Design a protein around this ligand. Structure first.
Ligand SMILES: Nc1ncnc2c1ncn2[C@@H]1O[C@H](COP(=O)(O)OP(=O)(O)OP(=O)(O)O)[C@@H](O)[C@H]1O
Ligand SMILES: [Ca+2]
Ligand SMILES: [Ca+2]
Ligand SMILES: [Ca+2]
Ligand SMILES: [Ca+2]
Length: 270
């Protein structure tokens, strides 16, 4: 007809890679993470901010990819690391973000046992804020039907780490956890925007203030107990008093035991 669908041209200028940026940085390997992704802190470069590089391989590559897009979306609502560079190849994902300065909620809870109540109060406020984001803004789905189908896949592929089961399920086969979990069903969904892994090592305090969260790969719409149960579990390692204070400050007098138990068992599959 008139104009050709495609026009022979020359090679466009490509993007500047990691090599141009990462030069001059000192490296430190993270030992905290247990997800399989390799993680490094980049520091010691004058006039440059500290960074984190998270590298996922195989199935973990998908996990890091999921983290990147949820990081990209949620950043408009909550304080998150800034995406500096992301690369996806068929079996690899590299995520370079800004470091959030300070210590995790877990660290400050150990280093300062007397600041426990204050820490919990901040966590509750942060959580109320996260759960106040209008659901209509969230492009990500993390409801129980979705997570369960996901959990079943991880089970059938022998990926579920039984050594990470809670004390109550020490020695249980993954099949028994799966079976018993369904006996708690059903329950009425209370859908909000959730974090997916609202644990003490994912929340960072700096100078007496919670200034951000990380590890946002499971962000999406789910029951509010998806975040509550996990944080409640983490606090149990410290004190039942703090657990109680979390719910009090969040706005719930008495925890829904069934909803609490379901999400705690669900988390065993991930
Ligand atoms: N952007 C960041 N800012 C500050 N600290 C970070 C950042 N990214 C990672 N870290 C540090 O590295 C640790 C591991 O990070 P992350 O939780 O993403 O790894 P993971 O393998 O998913 O860990 P987990 O086994 O808890 O899932 C964190 O506990 C945190 O201390
Ligand atoms: Ca590591
Ligand atoms: Ca983590
Ligand atoms: Ca993680
Ligand atoms: Ca577990």
């Amino acid at each position: 007809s008139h104009i050709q669908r495609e026009t022979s041209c020359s090679r466009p200028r490509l993007n500047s890679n990691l090599d141009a940026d990462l030069y001059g940085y000192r490296w430190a390997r993270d030992n905290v993470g247990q997800s399989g992704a390799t993680i490094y802190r980049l520091y010691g470069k004058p006039n440059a901010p500290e960074l984190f590089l998270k590298h996922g391989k195989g199935s973990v590559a998908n996990d890091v990819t999921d983290e990147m897009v949820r990081l990209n979306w949620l950043t408009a609502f909550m304080p998150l690391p800034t995406i500096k560079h992301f690369i996806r190849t068929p079996d690899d994902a590299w995520l370079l973000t800004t470091a959030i300065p300070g210590k995790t909620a877990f660290q400050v809870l150990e280093e300062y046992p007397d600041s426990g109540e204050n820490i919990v109060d901040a966590l509750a406020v942060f959580l109320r804020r996260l759960h106040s984001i209008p659901v209509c803004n969230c492009p990500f789905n993390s409801d129980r039907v979705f997570r369960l189908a996901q959990a079943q896949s991880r089970m059938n592929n022998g990926l579920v780490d039984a050594s990470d089961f809670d004390d109550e399920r020490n020695g249980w086969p993954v099949e028994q956890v799966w079976k018993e979990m369904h006996k708690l069903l059903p329950f009425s969904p209370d859908s909000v925007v959730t974090h997916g892994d609202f644990s003490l090592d994912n929340l960072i305090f700096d100078e007496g203030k919670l200034i951000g969260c990380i590890d946002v790969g499971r962000v999406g719409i789910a029951d509010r107990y998806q975040d509550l149960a996990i944080l409640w579990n983490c606090l149990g390692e410290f004190s039942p008093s703090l657990q109680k204070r979390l719910f009090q400050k969040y706005g719930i007098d008495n925890p829904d035991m069934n909803k609490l138990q379901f999400h705690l068992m669900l988390d065993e599959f991930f």
